Amino acid sequence: AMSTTSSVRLRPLEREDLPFVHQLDNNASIMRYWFEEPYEAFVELCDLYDKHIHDQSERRFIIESQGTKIGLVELVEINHIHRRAEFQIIIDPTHQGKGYAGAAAKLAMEYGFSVLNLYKLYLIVDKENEKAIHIYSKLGFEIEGELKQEFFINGEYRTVIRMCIFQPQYLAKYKT
Amino acid sequence: SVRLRPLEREDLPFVHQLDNNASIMRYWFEEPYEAFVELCDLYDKHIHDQSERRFIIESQGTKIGLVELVEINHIHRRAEFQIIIDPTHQGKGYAGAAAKLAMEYGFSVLNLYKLYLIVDKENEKAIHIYSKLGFEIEGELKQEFFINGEYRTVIRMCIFQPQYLAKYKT
Amino acid sequence: SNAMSTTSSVRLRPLEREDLPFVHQLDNNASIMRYWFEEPYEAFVELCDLYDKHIHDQSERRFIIESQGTKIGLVELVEINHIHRRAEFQIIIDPTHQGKGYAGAAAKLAMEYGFSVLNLYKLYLIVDKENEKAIHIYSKLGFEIEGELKQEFFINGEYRTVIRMCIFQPQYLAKYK
Amino acid sequence: SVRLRPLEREDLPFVHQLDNNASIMRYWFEEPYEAFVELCDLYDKHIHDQSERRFIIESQGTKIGLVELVEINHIHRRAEFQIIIDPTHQGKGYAGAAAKLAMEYGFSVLNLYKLYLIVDKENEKAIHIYSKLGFEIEGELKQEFFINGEYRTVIRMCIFQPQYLAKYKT
Amino acid sequence: AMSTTSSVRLRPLEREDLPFVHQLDNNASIMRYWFEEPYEAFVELCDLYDKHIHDQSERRFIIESQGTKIGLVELVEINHIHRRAEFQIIIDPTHQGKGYAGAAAKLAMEYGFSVLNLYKLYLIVDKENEKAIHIYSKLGFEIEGELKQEFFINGEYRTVIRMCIFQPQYLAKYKT
Amino acid sequence: SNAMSTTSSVRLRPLEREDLPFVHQLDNNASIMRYWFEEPYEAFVELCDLYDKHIHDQSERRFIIESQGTKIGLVELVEINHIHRRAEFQIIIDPTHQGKGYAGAAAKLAMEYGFSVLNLYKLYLIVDKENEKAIHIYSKLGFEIEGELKQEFFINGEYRTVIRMCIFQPQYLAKYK
Numbered sequence A, E: 001a002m003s004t005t006s007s008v009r010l011r012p013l014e015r016e017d018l019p020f021v022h023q024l025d026n027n028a029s030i031m032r033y034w035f036e037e038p039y040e041a042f043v044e045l046c047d048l049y050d051k052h053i054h055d056q057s058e059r060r061f062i063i064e065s066q067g068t069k070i071g072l073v074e075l076v077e078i079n080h081i082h083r084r085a086e087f088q089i090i091i092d093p094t095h096q097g098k099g100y101a102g103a104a105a106k107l108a109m110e111y112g113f114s115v116l117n118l119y120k121l122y123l124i125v126d127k128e129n130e131k132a133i134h135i136y137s138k139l140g141f142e143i144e145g146e147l148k149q150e151f152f153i154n155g156e157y158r159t160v161i162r163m164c165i166f167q168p169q170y171l172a173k174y175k176t
Numbered sequence B, D: 001s002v003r004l005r006p007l008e009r010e011d012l013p014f015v016h017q018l019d020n021n022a023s024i025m026r027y028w029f030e031e032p033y034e035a036f037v038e039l040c041d042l043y044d045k046h047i048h049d050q051s052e053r054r055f056i057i058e059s060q061g062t063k064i065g066l067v068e069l070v071e072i073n074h075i076h077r078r079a080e081f082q083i084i085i086d087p088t089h090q091g092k093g094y095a096g097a098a099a100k101l102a103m104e105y106g107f108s109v110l111n112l113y114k115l116y117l118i119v120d121k122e123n124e125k126a127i128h129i130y131s132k133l134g135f136e137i138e139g140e141l142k143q144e145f146f147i148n149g150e151y152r153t154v155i156r157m158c159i160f161q162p163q164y165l166a167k168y169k170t
Numbered sequence C, F: 001s002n003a004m005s006t007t008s009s010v011r012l013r014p015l016e017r018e019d020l021p022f023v024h025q026l027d028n029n030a031s032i033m034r035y036w037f038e039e040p041y042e043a044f045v046e047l048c049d050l051y052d053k054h055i056h057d058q059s060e061r062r063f064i065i066e067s068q069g070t071k072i073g074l075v076e077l078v079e080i081n082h083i084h085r086r087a088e089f090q091i092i093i094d095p096t097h098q099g100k101g102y103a104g105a106a107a108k109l110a111m112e113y114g115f116s117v118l119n120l121y122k123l124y125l126i127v128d129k130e131n132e133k134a135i136h137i138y139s140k141l142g143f144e145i146e147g148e149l150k151q152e153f154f155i156n157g158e159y160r161t162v163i164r165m166c167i168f169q170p171q172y173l174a175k176y177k
């Protein structure tokens, strides 16, 4: 009743959302991928979007609150035989610090487990991203790996933490 | 005399029979196949795709096995590799020798920084071989594969280019 | 099973293009409508073109049943859905190999593939209600009747009623593992 | 406030007017063009080609110039770059600043080992700027370009990733 | 009359020559290119060959003597406005040490200057390839550059020497 | 040329798609056969399709002649061959701008582009033998007569004879550089 992340919801990403997606990081400071294919330019993103519209190996959702676009959920590496996927939550910089990361993570978990019928969801975060690690630990994720020097970013190799959670634990804890 | 050469179309029957038992899902450039004809069509579709690279392991003119480099990324300068030895040649120390050839190609030809591999946690022998070659354990991926009716846990191991080039490239 | 056992050499292998003549002659009599990935065919040439068009389609999967290198029959998994985690299967035995218990053995192999390789939750099949012997075989393998689809198929001049039977992943993995 | 952003289709008129005088042969992914319409068609044909990458240099929302990385090779881990400053913004020290942004992108984002550039041997000012940034002369390519009726000689200068990351990335 | 490099000639590369080309170095020990596109497998070479059959930016010739294939001449980076090209001579290992490198170099120079009407031909060779440097110096090439750590080969960066010769000097010295 | 000079503001710029209506109206009279990359056209729509098909063809190059932002005419370099290092050119002045000496000025610009940008060795042109004024202009610019092509064009009911004139790169670069 009295909270600020009460209007937070997911909806399917549309073509018209691409300008919002693109501006999440159009700085020539990182390599960005769409269905595992690199892009920088908006026009390149649009062409990749069109080429993969029926590809089920990734799925994306806009995070919105009261009609404004706050971020993106991506599920990638989706495999329905092993029943797993990786996810990532991206919050627009202008909407950080309002608790939306945590709320969106629960929405992503709910979609992956209760709609897609996955067994395992996992995520990767920088080892120095202590806040995200804390959020995911509190939601029930466990650390399964420390991938050493896995990404070259801004001139240095960074180490990431892989965390996972499983469908039985999720459905028990949040669908009791 | 163990060596690598590039995989060719005519090698596909050898590749396919490494496991044509309807007992596992197999992938080619991340696309599933079971039938030989399905593999052949996927092979044709990805002939210029640089995100994976494959090599036949041979000794004295016989085909011993396959090396696959997959998830190749030249910005992050890494790749996953897998060594598959034909069952009829598993007794002869080719796993270790092939692993060194894969390392040599990835580090000294492709100019990668990081090579990693995945092995079943119960595969103690392979884990030991890779530890002896200098690989370190970076993760234990829990229930990562559904195989033959159960979820299996795998070990991810990695090694880096400077350590390799120092130890084997003076 | 050890030295002193009866074991069958019946196995499944993935259907290949070169198997299509065997598939086609299982019933080339102009007596039934035949489908490949839900598209009708009669002529061998039509089957071949449909085969080519659906080579990478994951909604159906087929296997040749073989024993001692002879082709005995076909297993089809159709209507595969990995979100609801189910599929329908059918076992078709060549007429020249019927009456030797290959239907039952093939069914176990199909169950094993669907549950232990494909990671499905539910497998089901349809059989004619008058086919008491097949119903009994499937009951003995652990299938339960879930419904009776009335006049669901027009076959040889009359509407036939079929029985839908199913089995689930936990019961299977427990009982055969 | 000088920055890079990825080149877009809508930037092509700006690119084209940097030299639309019928006075030089210009190339896009190594294919010649003169007319704007020809550039636009080449742009469309190469939108996913990773062998070149381009960026608009901007300051305070105005378009100042273009950075091009060409001949990109991720096995040898090198690329050529060129900085082109609009004539109306040449007086303001943007050449040097843009060069540092190009270096930063090539070394700290793309993970290249070697960046090099070509400049006319008579362009003493540019040579001085690049020398001050740490580039060393590696060659003098004699009569390498026919321009305005005569063969011109150019200087090739290069710099490497370890020196860069040490000096500007601590 | 009495010499061994008297039957040496060039002819245009044909599709049927691709197996000979491929085996010049099918060891998974170097990255190979065809019209600047990478390949390893023979099938990949064949597809690239087909795609570039009318591309004039490169031209290749088989070096033969008495009907046997001894090597390959490649002219690449051909530009007819600047009137230049790079060339390379590759001698099959089983035919090295019979003076064919030098003879083939003269054939390549003759084609580039007297048929293609180029102004400048240049080549790159490893700095430690003292024999090739000597051959090219004796033919009239001058050193124009030392490209530092230009190729990663077999685990190390190698430095190459760029050498060039011009059409007037050539036509004077060998067409007097 | 310095403060106190007569200089022309005549320039060349690369032909664009949007220039095609100007090109087409230079001679849309059903009085002559017109070619684009050696393919015939009459209709504007046909020209546009030919333009699109040859956008990256390097065997011809065209430029609009302009003065003070008005379109005056067209320069065409055709039959370009970079091995023999030659091309043919033609200067076409819009009828409403003829008689003001733009032909001569445009010819110098075309010579400069062909020799100093394209690196050609030989430029040549064809002119009607009865066109004494154009012959004189080209003679004054340094062209020499190399041949007289007899009854080479059927035009307006009769075979016409033309004069081929040429100039070479060394003579040009010496005399205007």
Ligand SMILES: [Ca+2]
Residues within 6 Å of the ligand: A036, A077, B030
């Ligand atoms: Ca993937």
Ligand SMILES: [Ca+2]
Residues within 6 Å of the ligand: A036, B030, B071
């Ligand atoms: Ca991947």
Ligand SMILES: [Ca+2]
Residues within 6 Å of the ligand: C038, C079
């Ligand atoms: Ca269906």
Ligand SMILES: [Ca+2]
Residues within 6 Å of the ligand: D030, D071, E036
């Ligand atoms: Ca190139």
Ligand SMILES: [Ca+2]
Residues within 6 Å of the ligand: D030, E036, E077
């Ligand atoms: Ca090139």
Ligand SMILES: [Ca+2]
Residues within 6 Å of the ligand: F038, F079
């Ligand atoms: Ca012609």
